[PDB]
């Protein structure tokens, strides 16, 4: 959840907001080790419930999200239903565990390609066009993340937009991402330069991947 003023500005300037619980357990092995554990349900529940209680009156918030990259655990299903029960006014989405689980109203993959399948075991990323028409699938598809804009990037962006416009159930996505996470450091003369992972003696680190 963001700084409270963010929602007020989005209400007033006009932007649709996906408000997202502060839950990410990416580093766990496997990713849902905590989120499938009933011992972590209380802690997870507070990150979802207290977000809803705070932000539910904002018109800019149109979709609730259960967090990011925490696999798919039984705790997600429980909290999905909790939101559906207390706030029927907003769809709930969640990407973890293959982007189309029972804890999401919207197929919301990250970095699924337009035409090319990436058939990873258990959590494949289908071509977005193909994904829509998988047997039994009826939901809209909106990428929670696509077109990773790292450095000299955004090649193939037009291919996404051509597809979004042609397919009714392809309703767009959220680019990753808005602003480089570089930090300012100073040289011996006090001149500022843009720093990234590893520049603060921080180790281990993932270098320029924050930008």
Q: Can you give the binding site for a copy of itself, defined by CB under 8 A?
A: 117, 127, 129-130, 132-136, 138, 166-169
- 69 catalytic? Reply is yes
147 carries a ligand binding annotation = yes
- 46 catalytic? Reply is no
117 binds, among a copy of itself, Na ion, none (CB under 5 to 8 A by kind): a copy of itself
Nearest to 129 by CA among 144, 139, 141: 141
Which entry of 20, 46, 69, 188 is annotated as an active-site residue? 69
Question: Where is 99: in which H helix or E strand?
Answer: none
Phi and psi based region of residue 207 (left: phi greater than 0; alpha: psi -120 to 50; beta: remaining): left
What are the CA-CA distances from residue 202 to residues 4, 111, 186, 195, 210 (Å)?
31, 29, 17, 12, 13
78 carries a ligand binding annotation = no
138 binds, among a copy of itself, Na ion, none (CB under 5 to 8 A by kind): a copy of itself
The H-assigned helical ranges of the chain are 4-13, 41-55, 74-86, 128-132, 157-166
Nearest distance, CB of residue 72 and a copy of itself, angstroms: 22
State the binding site.
24, 26, 69, 145-148, 205, 209
State the binding site for substrate.
69, 145-148
Catalytic residues: 69, 145
């Amino acid at each position: 959840p963001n700084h409270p003023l963010w929602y007020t500005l989005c209400d007033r300037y006009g932007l649709y907001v996906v408000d997202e619980a502060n839950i990410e357990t990416h580093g766990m092995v496997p990713m849902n080790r905590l989120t499938d554990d009933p011992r972590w349900l209380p802690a997870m529940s507070e990150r979802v419930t207290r977000m809803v209680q705070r932000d539910r009156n904002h018109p800019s918030v149109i979709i609730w999200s259960l967090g990011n990259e925490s696999g798919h655990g039984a705790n997600h299903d429980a909290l999905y239903r909790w939101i559906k029960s207390v706030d029927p006014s907003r769809p709930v989405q969640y990407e973890g565990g293959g982007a189309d689980t029972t804890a999401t109203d919207i197929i919301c993959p990250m970095y699924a390609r337009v035409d090319e399948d990436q058939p990873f075991p258990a959590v494949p990323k289908w071509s977005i066009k193909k994904w829509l028409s998988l047997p039994g699938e009826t939901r809209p598809l909106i990428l929670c993340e696509y077109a990773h804009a790292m450095g000299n990037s955004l090649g193939g962006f037009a291919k996404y937009w051509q597809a979004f416009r042609q397919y009714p159930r392809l309703q767009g996505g959220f680019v990753w991402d808005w602003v480089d996470q570089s930090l300012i450091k100073y040289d011996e003369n006090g001149n500022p330069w843009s720093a990234y992972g590893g520049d603060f003696g921080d180790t281990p680190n993932d270098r320029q991947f924050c930008m």
